[PDB]
Design a protein around this nucleic acid. Structure first.
Ligand SMILES: *[C@@H]1O[C@H](CO)[C@@H](O[C@@H]2O[C@H](CO)[C@@H](O)[C@H](O)[C@H]2NC(C)=O)[C@H](O)[C@H]1NC(C)=O
Ligand SMILES: *[C@@H]1O[C@H](CO)[C@@H](O)[C@H](O)[C@H]1NC(C)=O
Ligand SMILES: *[C@@H]1O[C@H](CO)[C@@H](O)[C@H](O)[C@H]1NC(C)=O
Ligand SMILES: *[C@@H]1O[C@H](CO)[C@@H](O)[C@H](O)[C@H]1NC(C)=O
Ligand SMILES: *[C@@H]1O[C@H](CO)[C@@H](O)[C@H](O)[C@H]1NC(C)=O
Ligand SMILES: *[C@@H]1O[C@H](CO)[C@@H](O)[C@H](O)[C@H]1NC(C)=O
Ligand SMILES: *[C@@H]1O[C@H](CO)[C@@H](O)[C@H](O)[C@H]1NC(C)=O
Ligand SMILES: *[C@@H]1O[C@H](CO)[C@@H](O)[C@H](O)[C@H]1NC(C)=O
Ligand SMILES: *[C@@H]1O[C@H](CO)[C@@H](O)[C@H](O)[C@H]1NC(C)=O
Ligand SMILES: [Mg+2]
Length: 750
DNA sequence: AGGCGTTTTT
DNA sequence: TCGCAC
């Protein structure tokens, strides 16, 4: 039986997904479809320019409707083609159950009539230039109204959006209003007092006063950022804040006693008026980024009262054309007892010392400090030792060079107690002195430095808690026998992209240190171009995962018997990545020398044109085999062998023309199979013996299926349809004639 | 005439 | 195969 909502796909929770189908009108679906059960209909990025009274009339329990990007205004069209969307008067009134509507990125100039059931309305990036009391008649349950981007450089209109005084007072339930990028010069008058979120960023509102926020005493978030910009930082078209602006009255915010979040970013602020924060006792988030507060933060008392503040953004408060020799934060930061997160990135200052951050040093809840992109060249990392709550320091993208004068394969540090990011700095050697006071660290990132050192066991000595060390993108010379042995808790080591030493033809390297790392569980040697003159064996009783992708095992395994047991000493290994190793051949004997403990083997993007499937019996614990991106021309040469525990097989992006009968029949644990992007002209149940009904995933997209009338694959795919992703749209014909490139459902082949 | 295309946010 | 110790 056919998928029920062709050409669309039924997804969980009553979602009918019609996205990206190039539809010119709303599909009606068959009278046999359960139109009753449809709660959400997605029509994202089709090319529907005309909506009709009958379009949604049969979807009698429809709650969510997404029509975004159907008819973009010329400024937002990728080719600047104009578009105007017509909407018959009852299009949405015919859906009395509708709760959420997205009409954004559509060329409409008025708000259509809407049912009184509506709770959320998105009208962003349309050409609606006015809201008056008749625009939103009857929407007494509306809680969210987003209408951003109706008049700006990507969607110009030649005037300000006009929201008439009191236009929205009839929306007595309205809690969220967003009117960003609308060329406003004043705040709309007499907005609904129920508002909790008012977002007015990236307009040209350059004066504020208490009268502009009259009666908005329920506000929890107010965003007025980006209304008076510093164009020297801008990535986009930008007009400079005029001289002597902005003008924000002392008492602008003083009635907003419930305010939790205030955004004053990119407002050309050189000074902070302490009165702005008076009476904001519930304020937890303050964004002051992209202002000119570099001197103010050394002297201000404006933070004195902010006892509930959790997150403070001061990023990109830099002085044009300069960096500072020194920076000393004001004493008043010490009263921020709730502070959890401070962002000081992009201020530009050259020395980080005891005095810089002293007011923060006893703040008990301070967990995350962002100090990246500051051109810091001298950093006393010892300053952090006695910070009582610190979990994360970002010092990446600086100029520090020393002491002062798949998570399967590599875990992240997100769950760890103390992480320092020193990636993208200027280290060329690692000296232990710089880490002397950092013995509490669990994770250290040193990726993308210039480390060129023959590490030997003396570099990381103080780091006795360190579990994860990221040295990727450096030039470490792997040679000495005791590298990394000074890290007694090391579990994960990333040495990927340290290729330059391995490219020194004629100079060998030594990986014997891996055997000396008794706690190591995850290692990456990926993208190192390892190809000759290296240790003949890697050895570890502890290692679980090894990423060896992006090397030349092809060259190693061609050199007689030298490297045929290279991985065999990894006695507990469960996951191995041998992707992108230029492999044109394997021997069964070579596969049999991989660790018998292996559960996952990746061989992606090699050049294998043959695979001896019987050799899988040599890997009796194997559950996942990834052969995507090779050059197989068939699934033949014996079938999957009896007894295999294989659960997942990926042979996508090969050149597979046919599969032998019964190829998969003996893989009784097989659940996921990817045949995508091969040269298969059919899909046959006989491939599977009598076990095709057991598959949970069968991907057959991007194959040149032969769509002859009565083609047998059609019935088969309908029988297993629950397992086939994208069946309604991405399973396409390669032939005959005009069917080439069309869905197998474009015409009824039965 | 319409088409284009996977498009966050500045 | 990188200051070892003919
Ligand atoms: C089957 O394989 C195809 C092709 O190898 C997968 O499609 C790719 O998926 C990744 C994301 O997982 C994308 O980054 C690629 O750019 C996609 N490429 C193509 C050509 O589609 C597909 O997702 C796999 N199927 C399943 C069910 O995992
Ligand atoms: C913004 O409004 C002014 C008129 O006040 C107009 O000059 C300008 O073109 C408008 N900007 C855009 C992007 O339409
Ligand atoms: C707000 O909506 C609720 C429930 O959707 C409704 O009962 C109430 O009458 C509405 N209130 C106002 C002030 O319109
Ligand atoms: C604020 O509310 C008061 C009392 O309800 C009313 O008199 C006043 O007009 C409102 N202010 C504005 C600017 O709408
Ligand atoms: C926070 O807002 C509440 C209402 O939630 C109000 O009673 C109080 O004045 C505000 N300040 C604090 C510190 O609770
Ligand atoms: C590491 O090399 C240095 C010379 O830079 C040497 O002094 C030190 O003893 C070596 N450490 C080990 C563990 O061999
Ligand atoms: C690798 O280094 C270890 C420890 O120093 C040493 O025993 C072994 O001989 C070295 N390998 C080569 C090929 O010299
Ligand atoms: C492998 O199968 C291919 C494709 O059917 C066939 O040409 C080839 O002779 C087979 N080789 C072996 C060794 O089985
Ligand atoms: C697979 O390898 C085994 C053992 O080397 C060999 O006996 C058999 O002939 C091979 N199969 C194919 C299809 O070449
Ligand atoms: Mg060499």
């Amino acid at each position: 039986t056919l998928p029920p909502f062709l050409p669309c796909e039924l997804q969980p929770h009553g979602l009918v997904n019609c996205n990206w189908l190039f539809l010119k009108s709303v599909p009606h679906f068959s009278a046999a479809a359960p139109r009753d059960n449809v709660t959400s209909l997605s029509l994202l990025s089709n090319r529907i320019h005309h909506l009709h009274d009958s379009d949604f009339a049969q979807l009698s329990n429809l709650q969510k409707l997404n029509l975004k990007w159907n008819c973009p205004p010329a400024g937002l069209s990728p080719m600047h083609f104009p578009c105007h969307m017509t909407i018959e008067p009852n299009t949405f009134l015919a859906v009395p159950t509708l709760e959420e509507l997205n009409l954004s990125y559509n060329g409409i100039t008025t708000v259509p009539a809407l049912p009184s059931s509506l709770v959320s309305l998105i009208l962003s990036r349309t050409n609606i230039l006015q809201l008056d009391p008749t625009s939103l008649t009857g929407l007494h349950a509306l809680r969210f109204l987003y209408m951003d981007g109706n008049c700006y450089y990507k969607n110009p209109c030649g005037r300000a959006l006009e929201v008439a005084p009191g236009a929205l007072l009839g929306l007595g339930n309205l809690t969220h209003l967003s009117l960003k990028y609308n060329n406003l010069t004043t705040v709309p008058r007499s907005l609904p007092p129920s508002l909790e979120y008012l977002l007015l960023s990236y307009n040209h509102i350059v004066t504020l006063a208490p009268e502009d926020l009259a009666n908005l005493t329920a506000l929890r978030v107010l965003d007025v950022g980006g209304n008076c910009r510093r164009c020297d930082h801008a990535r986009n078209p930008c007009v400079e804040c005029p001289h002597k602006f902005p003008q924000l009255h002392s008492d602008t915010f003083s009635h907003l006693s419930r305010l939790e979040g205030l955004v004053l970013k990119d407002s050309s602020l050189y000074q902070l008026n302490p009165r702005w924060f008076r009476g904001l006792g519930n304020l937890t988030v303050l964004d002051l980024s992209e202002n000119f507060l570099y001197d103010c933060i050394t002297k201000t008392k404006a933070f004195q009262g902010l006892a509930q503040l959790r997150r403070l953004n001061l990023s990109f408060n830099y002085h044009k054309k300069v960096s500072f020799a020194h920076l000393t934060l004001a004493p008043s930061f010490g009263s921020l007892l709730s502070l959890q997160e401070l962002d000081m990135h992009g201020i530009f200052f050259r020395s980080l010392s005891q005095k810089t951050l002293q007011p923060l040093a006893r703040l008990p809840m301070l967990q995350r400090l962002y100090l990246q992109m500051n051109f810091i060249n001298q950093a006393q990392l010892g300053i952090f030792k006695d910070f009582p709550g610190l979990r994360y320091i970002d010092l990446s993208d600086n100029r520090i060079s020393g002491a002062v004068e798949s998570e399967d394969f590599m875990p992240s540090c997100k769950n760890l107690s103390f992480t320092l990011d020193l990636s993208r700095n200027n280290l060329v050697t690692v000296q232990p002195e710089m880490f002397a006071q950092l013995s509490r660290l669990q994770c250290l990132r040193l990726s993308h430095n210039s480390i060129s050192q023959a590490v030997n066991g003396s570099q990381f000595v103080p780091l006795t808690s360190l579990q994860v060390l990221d040295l990727s993108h450096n030039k470490l010379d792997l040679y000495h026998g005791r590298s990394f042995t000074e890290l007694p808790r090391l579990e994960a080591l990333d040495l990927s992209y340290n290729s330059q030493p391995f490219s020194m033809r004629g100079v060998g390297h030594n990986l014997s240190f891996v055997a000396q790392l008794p706690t190591l569980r995850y290692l990456s040697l990926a993208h190192n171009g390892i190809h000759s003159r290296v240790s003949q064996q890697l050895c570890s009783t502890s290692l679980w995962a090894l990423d060896f992708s992006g090397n030349s095992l092809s060259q190693m395994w061609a050199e007689g018997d030298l490297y045929l047991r290279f991985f065999q000493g990894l006695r507990s290994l469960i996951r191995l990545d041998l992707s992108q190793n230029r492999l044109h051949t394997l021997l069964p004997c070579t596969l049999g020398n991989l660790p018998k403990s292996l559960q996952l083997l990746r061989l992606r993007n090699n050049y294998l044109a043959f695979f001896n499937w019987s050799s899988l019996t040599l890997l009796p614990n194997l559950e996942t085999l990834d052969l995507a991106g090779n050059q197989l021309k068939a699934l033949s040469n014996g079938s999957l062998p009896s007894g295999t525990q294989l659960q997942r097989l990926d042979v996508s992006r090969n050149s597979i023309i046919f599969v032998v009968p019964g190829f998969f029949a003996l893989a009784t644990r097989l659940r996921e199979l990817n045949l995508s992007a091969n040269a298969l002209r059919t899909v046959e149940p006989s491939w599977f013996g009598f076990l095709a009904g057991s598959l949970e995933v069968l991907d057959v997209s991007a194959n040149p299926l032969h769509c002859a009338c009565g083609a047998a694959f059609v019935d088969f795919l309908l029988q297993v349809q629950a397992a086939v992703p994208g069946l309604p749209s991405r399973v396409k014909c390669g032939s005959p004639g005009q069917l080439q490139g069309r869905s197998i459902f474009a015409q009824d082949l039965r």
